Design goal:
The structure is cut from a larger assembly and holds chains A, B, C, D, E and F. By secondary structure, chain A is mainly α. Chain A contains 13 helices and no strands. In chain A, helix 8 packs antiparallel against helix 9, helix 10 packs across helix 12 and helix 11 crosses helix 13. Chain A is flat. The relative contact order of chain A is 0.06. Chain B is an all-alpha fold. By secondary structure, chain E is mainly alpha-helical. Classes of the chains: A mainly alpha, B mainly alpha, C alpha+beta, D mainly beta, E mainly alpha, F mainly alpha. Chain B: This is U3 small nucleolar RNA-associated protein 5. Chain B: Involved in nucleolar processing of pre-18S ribosomal RNA. Required for optimal pre-ribosomal RNA transcription by RNA polymerase I together with a subset of U3 proteins required for transcription (t-UTPs).
């Protein structure tokens, strides 16, 4: 396999022509050299060089990349492309790294992007709301706009009421003889 | 507790051992939050049967 | 042709009050006035 | 206490203990960790000889066992790998997919 | 079964718009449930129940959302109090 | 209480006193709703201050 990769069964044939539990189990038993030479097959290897991966397949990395640094992940999240990448990379960062690590990363991160994202979320998801908690904790309590505070306040108020009655309706969908005289009829 | 945290938040930021100094508070509020969701489910069941026998 | 109803097992008097008003006089013996204190024989329900 | 909060959940978790108690191996799904015991933080080496504590693996890690302070055998859901600890060099590997 | 068809349409629309700020559809739903839940359950066995589990999954996601949201609500309130103390 | 009501649904209607017992139960459990939600807000600013 190493010789085939350097000169470049289904994956080896595809690599030769171009030049996954079964695939990782047959191609992971050298690996660093193969990955460097490679840098489809790359997606499978990522399924099976953190700076290179960050600079780089985008969805494949953001879902299944083994090495992924906080700074580049927060930059990619803070891009305003918004192709559901907000949920995807919020899930990815909460799956990969710790609360205090994200806190200190956002401490490093500039406040202008923080304000931009507060505006974006207030204008137009529990991972996202956890990220909002994290970013408020990282910005702390001193530097933050009162107007943006009030916009986020009304946003969060309508959101808490919608979540409340949503929970109520969720649980809701989760859910003697004849009297002293009766005025009765009869057939024939 | 709300006013304490409001008027002395910075000292709590400066202190190194927040868990070590508010473990008891944390336990109380954590158990209250854990009570929350089942309580709301109970509320939904309640007002369900409430309105049910109020209309009938 | 004829008919017979089983809707009235307890009944004391059947008659015609008027041309088309029947009267059926029934009982509610145990459920209303006696209310007798009876020996407990519980049912194993589970 | 080391208290991460990971959104995902996978019970494929294991830990091994260095015989001197300095470090703890943690086999987590598709990841190997080595945690310093003095503070429950990552195994930081000032010399930076690529003896890192974040090792990627193909499948969910089932077992991680150190036979001594030098040899570590890890068995993941598809294979098994024997590696050195003083030097980050792999020695042996065998398959679990056929069986 | 006109009420059943209304239920079907309401459930489909609610699933399509889980975060709709309107309340008329939820309130119609909750009256309909608190009145005729049993006959609802006895109507159908496959498609209505599959839609029910879809919507219930969405609602459980919303319930998961709720507590962090309340926490940030408290964050906003305490920041407001901090601003009040700042201006005083 | 949930199982007792799920069994004795219509008897709640037939018996009048149990209805207002339920009413005060609703009032107090809404009070506890407020307590628990304020506790969740407590969660929020403690997680901020830590």
């Amino acid at each position: 396999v190493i010789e085939k990769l350097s000169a470049l069964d289904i994956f080896f044939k595809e690599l030769k022509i171009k030049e996954y539990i079964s695939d990782p189990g047959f191609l992971n038993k050298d690996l660093i050299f193969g990955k460097f030479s490679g840098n489809t097959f790359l997606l499978t290897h990522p399924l099976f060089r953190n700076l290179l991966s960050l600079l780089r397949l985008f969805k494949q990395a953001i879902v299944t990349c083994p090495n992924l640094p906080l700074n580049e992940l927060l930059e990619e999240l803070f891009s305003i492309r918004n192709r559901e990448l907000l949920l995807d990379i919020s899930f990815r960062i909460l799956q990969d790294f710790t609360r205090d690590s994200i806190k200190q990363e956002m401490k490093k991160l500039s406040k202008l992007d923080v304000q931009n994202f507060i505006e974006f979320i207030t204008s137009g998801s529990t991972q996202l709301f956890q990220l909002l908690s994290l970013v408020l904790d990282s910005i702390g309590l001193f530097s933050l706009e009162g107007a943006l505070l009030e916009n986020l306040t009304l946003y969060i108020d309508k959101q808490v009421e919608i979540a409340e009655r949503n929970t109520e309706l969720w649980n809701l969908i989760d859910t003697r003889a004849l009297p002293t005289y009766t005025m009765e009829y009869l057939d024939i | 507790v709300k006013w304490c945290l409001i008027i002395h938040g910075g000292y709590l930021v400066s202190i190194p051992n927040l868990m070590s100094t508010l473990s008891s508070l944390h336990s109380t509020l954590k158990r209250r939050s854990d009570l929350l969701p089942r309580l709301l489910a109970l509320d939904a069941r309640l007002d369900c049967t409430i309105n049910k026998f109020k209309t009938l | 042709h004829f008919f017979f109803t089983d809707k009235y097992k307890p009944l004391l008097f059947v008659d015609l009050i008027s041309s088309n008003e029947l009267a059926i006089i029934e009982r509610n013996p145990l459920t209303f006035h006696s209310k007798q204190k009876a020996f407990i024989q519980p049912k194993l329900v589970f | 206490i080391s208290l991460p909060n990971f959104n995902h959940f996978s019970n494929s978790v294991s830990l091994a203990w260095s015989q001197d108690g300095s470090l703890i191996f943690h086999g987590f799904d598709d990841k190997l960790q080595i945690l310093d015991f003095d503070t429950f933080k990552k195994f930081e080496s000032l010399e930076n000889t690529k003896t890192v504590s974040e090792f990627t693996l193909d499948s969910e890690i089932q077992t991680v066992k150190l036979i001594n302070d030098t040899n570590l055998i890890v068995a993941t859901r598809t294979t098994l790998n024997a590696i050195n600890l003083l030097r980050g060099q792999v020695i042996n590997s065998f398959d679990l997919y056929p069986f | 079964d006109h009420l059943s068809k209304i239920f079907l349409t309401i459930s489909k629309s609610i699933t399509q718009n889980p975060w709709n700020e309107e309340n008329l559809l939820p309130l119609w739903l909750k009256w309909l449930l608190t009145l005729k839940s049993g006959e609802l359950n006895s109507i159908k066995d496959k498609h209505t129940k599959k839609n029910c589990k879809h919507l219930k999954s969405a609602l459980r996601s919303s319930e998961e959302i709720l507590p962090v949201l309340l926490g940030i609500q408290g964050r906003l309130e305490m920041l407001r109090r901090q601003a009040k103390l700042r201006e005083d | 209480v949930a199982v007792v009501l799920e069994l004795y649904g219509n008897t709640l209607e037939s018996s009048p006193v149990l209805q207002e017992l339920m009413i005060d139960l609703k009032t107090k459990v809404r009070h506890e709703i407020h307590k628990s939600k304020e506790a969740q807000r407590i969660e929020g600013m403690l997680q901020l201050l830590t």
